[PDB]
């Protein structure tokens, strides 16, 4: 099982890299802006760490002083799971105001990308969110598996109720 080692590794690296501090943009005055979107910010950004357990799934763990980013590529082999996760991430990022953390336009080449700032780290605990990330990932995986398993029942029921009428 290569799932628990990867989960432990991502949890540990996230807990180690989660360090948000207040910083004023040295370019523009009296406007707190990010450090991964505006300008370049060469001497502030850290090395983007990445962890992977397979070829179709990975997560880019980027770090900064006040612009830490995080993204994961959900596993997908068939078109069913592909379109399922596509629609799920679309509907989840559409109403980004609910969580106040998710983004609207994820980075190119990825499915979903989160976003955390100093305010988000102070309004909530650290280990709580660290565990909630893994819990949400596992719950999304299980829900996708169920939906894949939930369509067969409806399909066979429709088949049996449409062929038994005669």
């Amino acid at each position: 099982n290569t799932l628990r080692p990867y989960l432990n590794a991502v949890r540990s690296t996230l807990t180690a890299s989660l360090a948000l501090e207040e910083f004023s943009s040295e370019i523009v005055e009296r406007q707190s802006q990010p450090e991964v979107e505006v300008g370049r910010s060469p001497e502030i950004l850290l090395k983007p760490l990445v962890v992977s357990r397979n070829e179709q799934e990975q997560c880019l763990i980027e770090s900064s002083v006040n612009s830490v980013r995080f993204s994961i590529r959900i596993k997908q082999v068939d078109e069913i799971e592909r379109i399922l996760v596509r629609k799920f991430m679309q509907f989840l990022m559409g109403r980004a105001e609910s969580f106040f953390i998710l983004r609207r336009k994820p980075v190119q080449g990825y499915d979903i990308s989160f976003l955390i700032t100093n305010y988000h780290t102070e309004e909530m605990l650290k280990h709580k969110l660290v565990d909630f990330i893994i819990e949400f990932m596992e719950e999304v995986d299980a829900e996708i598996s169920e939906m894949k398993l939930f369509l067969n029942g409806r399909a066979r029921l429709v088949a049996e109720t449409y062929l038994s009428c005669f």
Partner: protein, 370 residues
């Protein structure tokens, strides 16, 4: 295919309206409720079916509360069921239309658009305000007999009433005064003056409207048996709303005073037009000899505002142009005007098709036009 007959559906509390354009009577009417109950978790009645199967409907809760959509998981089910098993309509054949109470929030409007667009994979969405939909129905009268979006929409419901003026089509909800008094007040009044189903049957069978009780009583001494006697209750019923003190002294502010305050709160420049013509929404405050009663009350209350102001200020203001027009059948007139508004060739020039959504998402779902 961009030319078929559109569909108008004004879903709200209690009874929900739904049908087609180019008509005068509703095709279906029933209360908004579903008889919700391993697998096969989709067997639940709707409308009259649920009202009859309540025996085993297992707590047929209501899916709508205070007009605003609160249970989307059940609202979508109700919508799809009413569209498939009670309308037999093809979604990929013509345009659609949704309902939204006054001041509907962008969040809820976008949620409704997204749940009614991607779920059924339709093509064409359109949402408007109840005020404009009700005002467009009064165009059939000989007063306007044209397109003139200027006036006020006083929605008097069964539970509560409200008013939402419109300034040249744009409803300005900055100053509004709602009247909690509704049909329930008159129902309780009638029930108390005779010491649910029987009360409603007695209230929806005979209801007079008199200028004043002092004259109603004088004319009464100079009557009907159904269902068990009647009397001055028919004369006192309507006054319960005109003079709240008769029914409930809590909201002493009467209807004429509320209308005057609402029309005077806005700038006078636009109020001079708003006070010209007004239309009532729904068919609750539609009693025999009712509209003219409110017109007389307003033209009598405006005395101390016009005649006295002319002498106080010293300027002849010939603003005698108020003329209230009452609908003939407003019980389901919320879509009567919508049908005429959608039958215009330019109805499709202010909508969004699949090409305007597939490459834009749920962003363009709030800004509309006439």
């Amino acid at each position: 295919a961009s030319f078929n007959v559109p569909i108008i559906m004004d879903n709200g509390t209690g009874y929900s309206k739904l049908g087609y354009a180019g008509n005068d009577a509703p095709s279906y009417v029933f209360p908004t409720v579903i008889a919700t109950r391993a697998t096969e978790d989709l067997d639940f009645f709707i409308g009259n079916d649920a009202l009859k199967k309540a025996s085993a409907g297992y707590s047929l809760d209501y899916p709508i509360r205070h007009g605003q959509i609160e249970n989307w998981d059940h609202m979508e089910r109700f919508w799809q069921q009413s569209l498939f098993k009670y309308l037999r309509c093809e979604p990929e054949d013509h345009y659609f239309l949704l309902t939204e109470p006054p001041l509907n929030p962008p969040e809820n409007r976008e949620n409704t658009a997204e749940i009614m667009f991607e779920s059924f994979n339709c093509a064409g969405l359109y949402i408007a305000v109840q005020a404009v939909l009700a005002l467009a129905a009064s165009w059939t009268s000989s007063k306007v007999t044209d397109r003139s979006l200027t006036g006020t929409v006083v929605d008097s419901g069964d539970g509560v009433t409200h008013i939402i003026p419109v300034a040249e089509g744009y409803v300005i909800g900055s100053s509004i005064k709602t009247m909690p008094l509704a049909g329930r007040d008159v129902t309780y009044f009638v029930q108390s003056l005779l010491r649910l189903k029987t009360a409603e049957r007695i209230k929806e069978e005979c209801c007079y409207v008199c200028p004043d009780i002092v004259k109603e009583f004088s004319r009464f001494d100079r009557l009907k048996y159904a269902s068990i006697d009647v009397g001055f209750e028919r004369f006192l019923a309507p006054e319960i709303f005109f003079n709240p003190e008769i029914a409930s002294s809590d909201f002493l502010t009467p209807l004429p005073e509320l209308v005057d305050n609402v029309v005077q709160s806005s700038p006078i420049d636009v109020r001079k037009g708003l006070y010209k013509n007004i239309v009532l929404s729904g068919g609750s405050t539609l009693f025999k000899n009712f509209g003219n009663r409110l017109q007389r009350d307003l033209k009598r209350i405006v005395d101390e505002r016009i005649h006295r102001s002319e002498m106080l200020s010293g300027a002849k203001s010939g603003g005698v142009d108020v003329n209230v027009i009452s609908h003939k059948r407003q019980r389901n007139a919320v879509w009567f005007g919508g049908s005429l508004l959608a039958q215009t060739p330019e109805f499709g020039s202010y909508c969004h098709t699949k090409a305007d959504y597939e490459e834009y998402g749920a962003s363009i779902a709030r800004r509309y036009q006439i």
